[PDB]
Structures are given as structure tokens and as C-alpha cells.
Amino acid sequence: EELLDLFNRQVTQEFTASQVYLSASIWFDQNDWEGMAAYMLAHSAEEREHGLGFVDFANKRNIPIELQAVPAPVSCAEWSSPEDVWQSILELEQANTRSLLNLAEAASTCHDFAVMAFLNPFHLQQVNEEDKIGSILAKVTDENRTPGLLRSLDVVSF
Amino acid sequence: EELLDLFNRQVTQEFTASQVYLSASIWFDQNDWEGMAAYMLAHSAEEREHGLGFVDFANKRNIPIELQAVPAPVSCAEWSSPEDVWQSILELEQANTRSLLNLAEAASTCHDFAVMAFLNPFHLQQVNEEDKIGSILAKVTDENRTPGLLRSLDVVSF
Amino acid sequence: SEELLDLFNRQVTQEFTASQVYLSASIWFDQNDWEGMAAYMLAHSAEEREHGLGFVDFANKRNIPIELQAVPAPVSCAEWSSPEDVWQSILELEQANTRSLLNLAEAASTCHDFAVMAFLNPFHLQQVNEEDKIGSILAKVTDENRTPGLLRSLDVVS
Amino acid sequence: EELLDLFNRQVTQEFTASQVYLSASIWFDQNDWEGMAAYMLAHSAEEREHGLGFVDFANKRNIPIELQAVPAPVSCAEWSSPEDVWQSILELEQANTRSLLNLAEAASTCHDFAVMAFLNPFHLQQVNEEDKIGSILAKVTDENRTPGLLRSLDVVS
Amino acid sequence: EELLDLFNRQVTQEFTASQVYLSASIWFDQNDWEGMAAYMLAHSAEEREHGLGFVDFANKRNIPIELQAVPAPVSCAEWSSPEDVWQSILELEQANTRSLLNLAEAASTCHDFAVMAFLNPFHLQQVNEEDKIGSILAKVTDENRTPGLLRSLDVVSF
Ligand SMILES: [Fe+3]
Ligand SMILES: [Fe+3]
Ligand SMILES: [Fe+3]
Ligand SMILES: [Fe+3]
Ligand SMILES: [Fe+3]
Ligand SMILES: [Fe+3]
Ligand SMILES: [Fe+3]
Ligand SMILES: [Fe+3]
Ligand SMILES: [Fe+3]
Ligand SMILES: [Fe+3]
Ligand SMILES: [Fe+3]
Ligand SMILES: [Fe+3]
Ligand SMILES: [Fe+3]
Ligand SMILES: [Fe+3]
Ligand SMILES: [Fe+3]
Ligand SMILES: [Fe+3]
Ligand SMILES: [Fe+3]
Ligand SMILES: [Fe+3]
């Protein structure tokens, strides 16, 4: 039952993340960072696709899915610079990584080899995501040390 | 008669706007902002096309058009930085939006459903224009906080 | 509102009535060796029928019950003696088609039937274009018919 | 500087003419001359393009441009036939030509070889335009001697 | 004879300019401005082509050409920033313009219509060159107000 639970909760986690990304895109769009806004919107969609992935596997493997409330994103209250937004997104992915590792540990305890196999590509994708977001946040933080310079690279990049 | 009046005045408004854009392109060209100058020139042409759109509809709908003087653009006297120019263009579009909404309210009072239908795409285009110009002005203002940096993005962008 | 439903039904009848009137014009023209005007009338007869079918299809989707009425015998051909008579009748028919569309829209507006208003929008615009075209053809017919044989020599052209 | 002033006035002249062409297109469309209307509309765009060409050269050559008002066209009030319209448009082109010639002479007095070179294709274009306009006006005026006949040829070109 | 003289001297002027451009490319290359160096090198070639143009016309028109020494470029002694180099190039083109205008005035006095015709495209090209170089110098001067920023646009641009 704990495994089935954690599986169900990973869907919520992916959908929660989707909404957080959407919130980041709104913040960026409202503050005229259209390039960062596009990035966040695309990633919102990707997180939804992850959750649907979990759903589909669950259905095939007879793991009951019950859809939970997708909480309101509330880090957009705190956000006052692009740096704040990217820092929250990095924490969000760090948590998504932790939630997948916990799920895998439950599967491992249960000898659920199909669930572990299913999760392998996600483990590796999370490594790539954390690295990419990490690297973006480092660039944002460095470029923002000179007034207007960050803007100058929402244009160029993204 | 008020409807016909306001319709006729929208043509003047579009042509007025066309000339303001041309004036902005001249200011930018003379001050070696060729990328912003190109943007303004293109938009000058677009505003002319809008006015011709109104003219064509008027002719088809038997709304008498009498062409009015197209005033001299005079905000180019005040302009001393790209920020001043973009601020004027934003106000210009805000006024173009207001003039279309007033026209639509007159059509609405008159139950002139064809005029309201005609205006729908313009209403939505104005939303997009104000948002784009708004976003440009925000970037200009931010980048101009560091000497030479704005220049560096007339090149890259535009 | 049962009355809005009546008006929508009545538009169907009006389109099919116009289709038959266009057909009657085609016949007159063909009988009198104006094959070019005849072809224009036949094509426009088909197009009015397409409009009526468009209304029926929307009505079916929107649960507006349709009761198909009699399509009355066109009566104007009894009195037509020149192409000018026929084009004037056709202009009058389109002016009527327009007034009934506007009556339907006013009812929809009163009932807050946003979907019906939206549906009608392209038709309001098409009617502007049709009246303008018809009116223009009538003006050319009238002018060319001041010289014997000249109108014929342009059934051959347009 | 007479040269700078005349260069500025030439821009206003081109946009003025653009509006006059637009007004002709209006008169024609209102009176169901869709062919002549389209010709006039196309020419209105072309006059504006000419003015833009002057603007562009002026910016390159550091000739300060101050955009003036574009005066409302006033000929339409008196037009009652296509002939009247074509006649006003001929007169408009003849004035466009005289003002180019005045600008060229001022350039010539100043030994402004760049401005004179710039103007050469416009002098040749005016010759072509005056000829074309004049020819259309001749055709209009002849065809309009028979009722309906002119209409029967808006439809052709 | 003065006309023939001035014609011969225009060849020297074009070749002199070619060498000045080459000197500018060397300065830029040695100071690691490869993008500005490429621009100068290309323009060096273009000035040579202009001189060869004059030569070819002269030969066809029986204007004796005697090739003069092409002086050593010596503004590269003074150069210490990209701004100094572009300022010299602007002066160089301003002088090339003056030399063409003087030539045209001699042709004009002599009623040498073929020489004036030959020169027309050069007059217009000089207008375009002065404007372009002017605009580059303005950008250089603005961007160089922030340390490293100019560099950042030798890369992007050019
Ligand atoms: Fe995810
Ligand atoms: Fe993710
Ligand atoms: Fe992912
Ligand atoms: Fe507009
Ligand atoms: Fe606009
Ligand atoms: Fe627009
Ligand atoms: Fe009823
Ligand atoms: Fe009923
Ligand atoms: Fe009924
Ligand atoms: Fe119809
Ligand atoms: Fe119809
Ligand atoms: Fe129709
Ligand atoms: Fe012109
Ligand atoms: Fe012209
Ligand atoms: Fe022209
Ligand atoms: Fe040269
Ligand atoms: Fe050169
Ligand atoms: Fe050159």
C-alpha cells in the first residue's frame, strides 16, 4: 500500500510542479521577460507529460490512481527578481528528484522490478534538469550584477 | 451621424499614428539606432494599412469619408533618448485603443452589428500591440541603465 | 426566448427564399439571352442555399428547432422587362436579407445570446460586401444601358 | 538654406500627393469605378514610397527632416465625372514635376552633385507618369462622349 | 589638363584609402578585434576596386594615367582605441567624398558629361559609406563607455 500511495503522490508532485512552472511564466511575462516566460511555459507542459506518464503506467500495472487537489503555487508572492524565480524552480526540481528517489526506495524494498525499471529514465532526466536549471540560475545571478545586463540575455538566449 | 463622424476620425487617427511612427524612425536613424528605426518604419506602414482598411469598409458600407489634415508629429521636439521615443509610441497606441473602443461603443448604441464585427480583430490587435510596445519600453528602460548597453541590443535584437 | 428562435428560423426561410429569387433571375436572363448575368444569378442562388444550410447546421448544434417553411413562388419576374429591373430586385432582396440579419442580431443581443451573436458576425460582414457588389453592378448596368446594344456587349465581358 | 527647405517641402509634396490619390480612389469607389479606384490606390502607395525615399536619403545625407502636416485634399468636392478626377491628378503630377525641377536647380547652384544624382531617376519617372496619366485622360475624355461607354472600359483596365 | 590631373589623382586617393583600411585591419587584428579587422580588410579591397574602376574608364576615355606613389598610412601611429581608428576612417571617407565632388566640379566646368555620368554612382555610394561609418563610430563610442562592452559586440556584430 505505501508503494501505491507514493506512486499516486508522484502524479500530484508532477502536476504541482507544472503549476509552479506556469506561475513562473506568468511572473516573467508580467515583468516582460518573454524568453524566460517561454522556457517556463514549455517546462510546465513537460511536467504535465511526466505526470500523465505515471498515470498511464499505473493504469497498466493496476495501481489505483486517485487524483488529488493540485495546490495553488504560492512562491510567486515572494518573487521580486528573476533570481528569486529560478531559485524556486531549482528547489522544486530538487524536491521532484527526492520524491522519485523515495519512490524507487519503496519499489526496491518491495522487489518491484517493473517500477524500478520504469523510473530509471526519470532518475537520469532529473540529473540533467537539475544541472541545467543550476547553470541557468548561476548565469542569472552573475549577469544581474550589472544593471540591465540580464535583460540583454533574455533577448539573445531563450 | 456621430457614428459616421467617429468612423471618419479613426482614419485620421491611423494616419496620424503612421506619421508619428515615421517621425520616430527619423529620430532613431539620425541618432544611429537603425534597428529601432526599422521597427518604427515598418509600423508606420502598418498604421497606414489600418487606415486604408477603414477607408475600404467605409466605402463598401456607404459611410462618407472626408480625408482630414494629418497633423505634424510634434513629440520629436521633446525626444532626447530612445526611452522618450518608446514612451510616446506607447501613449500613441493607448490612444489608438481608446479611439477604437469609443467607436465600438457608438456602433453598439446604434446596433450597428457590421461595424462591431469589423472592429473585433482591431480590438485584439491593439491588445497585442500595447503588450509588445510595453515590453520593449521596459527592456529599453532597463538596458539603458548601463552606458552603451542599449546600443548593444539595437544590434542583436531588431 | 421563443421569439429569438422564430427569428433564427425565419433567417433560414429568408435564405431559401432568396435562393429561389436568384434562380428566377437566372431564368429571366437565360430566356432573354443574357447568359453571363444568368450564370452569376445561378451561382448566387447556390450560395444563398449554402447560407441557409449553415444556419440549419448551427441550429441543430445549438438545439434551436427548425421548422422548414414553404419557399414562396417568386413574383418579381412577372414584372421584369429589362436587366435593370432584375438587378434592382436583387439589390432589394439583399437589403431585406441584411435587415433580417440585423433583426436577428438585436434579438440575440437582448437575450445575451453570445453564441448566436458570434455566429452572425461573418454574415454581417458578408452582407456589406454583397450589397456593395450588387449596387455597383446595378450602377454599371444602368449606365451602360443608356446606349443601345452596349449592355450586351458587356454581358460578354463580365 | 534654400536647398534644405526645398528638400523638406518635397517630402511634404509626396505625402500630399499620396493623399490626393487616396481621395481620387475614394471618389471612384463611391461612384462604382472599381478599376480606376484600384489604379489610384496603387499610385497613392507609390507617392508615399517616393516620400520615404527622400526621407531615407536625407537621413543619410544629414539633411534635417521636419515632418509637416499633410494637408487635407480639397479637389474631391468639385469632381463630378471621371474626367474631372484624371484632370486633377494630371495637374498634381505636373506640380510634382515642377517642384522636382526647382529642387534640382537649387542643388545645381549649390554644386550638390549627390542630390542631383539622387534626383535623376525621379525626373525620368515623372516623364513616364505624366505621359501615362495624360494618355489615360485622353482616353477617358474620348470614351465619355458616348453614354455608358466609359464604364464599359473601367471593367477592362 | 586640370581635369585629367584630378582624374589621375582620384586613382591615388582610392589606393591611399585602400592602404589606410589595410592599416586599420592590422591595428584591429593585432589588438584582437577580428570582426572590425575583417570589415576593414573588405573595405580595403573595395577601395582598390574603385581605383581600378577609374583606371579602366580613363583608359577607355584616353585620359593618360600615371600611377603615383601610394603613401605610407601614418594614422596607425596615433591609434590607441577602436574609437581612434573609426574616427580616422570617417575622415578618410569625408576626404574621398570631397575629392569626388571637386572632380565633378571640374568636369562640370569642362562640360564633360561622360565624366559626370561616370561619377554619379560614386557620389551616391559615398553618401551611403559616410552614413554607415558614421553610425558605426557612434555605436563604438557609446559601447566603449562600459569596460569590455565593445568587445562584446565585435563578436556579435561583424
Ligand atoms: Fe517532473
Ligand atoms: Fe522538470
Ligand atoms: Fe522532466
Ligand atoms: Fe493602428
Ligand atoms: Fe499600431
Ligand atoms: Fe496594428
Ligand atoms: Fe413564436
Ligand atoms: Fe415559433
Ligand atoms: Fe412556428
Ligand atoms: Fe444570404
Ligand atoms: Fe447573397
Ligand atoms: Fe452570401
Ligand atoms: Fe511622386
Ligand atoms: Fe506619381
Ligand atoms: Fe512615381
Ligand atoms: Fe573609395
Ligand atoms: Fe570607401
Ligand atoms: Fe565604396
TrEMBL record, chain C:
Q: Where does Fe(3+) 5 bind?
A: E15, E48
Residues involved in Fe(3+) 10 binding: H44, E47, E48, E94, E130
Per UniProt, the keywords (alphabetical) are: Iron, Iron storage, Metal-binding, Oxidoreductase, Signal, Zinc
Name the positions where Fe(3+) 7 binds.
Answer: D30, E35, D132
Binding-site residues for Fe(3+) 13, renumbered to this chain: E47, H51, Q126, E130
The positions annotated for binding Fe cation are: E15, E48, H51, E94, Q127
Which residues of the sequence carry a binding annotation for Fe(3+) 12? E47
Quick one: a GO cellular component term? cytoplasm
Q: Which stretches make up the Ferritin-like diiron domain?
A: 1-145
**Gene Ontology MF term list:** ferric iron binding; ferrous iron binding; ferroxidase activity; identical protein binding
Residues the entry annotates as binding Fe(3+) 3: E2, D6
Which GO terms fall under biological process for this protein? intracellular iron ion homeostasis; iron ion transport
User: What's the domain of life for this entry?
Assistant: Eukaryota
Residues bound to Fe(3+) 2 are E2, E3, D6
- Protein name as annotated: Ferritin
First-to-last residue of the parent protein present: 63 to 220 of 230
From TrEMBL, chain D:
- Residues that hold Zn(2+) 4 according to the record: E47, E93, E129
Q: Its GO CC terms?
A: cytoplasm
What keywords sit in the KW lines?
A: Iron, Iron storage, Metal-binding, Oxidoreductase, Signal, Zinc
Q: Where does Fe(3+) 3 bind?
A: E1, D5
Binding positions for Fe(3+) 10?
H43, E46, E47, E93, E129
Q: Which residues bind Fe(3+) 1?
A: E1, E2
Give me the residues that bind Zn(2+) 3, please: H43, E46, E129
> What is the documented function of this protein?
Stores iron in a soluble, non-toxic, readily available form. Important for iron homeostasis. Iron is taken up in the ferrous form and deposited as ferric hydroxides after oxidation.
Report the family membership: Belongs to the ferritin family.
The protein in question is named Ferritin
First and last residues shown, out of full length: 64 to 220 of 230
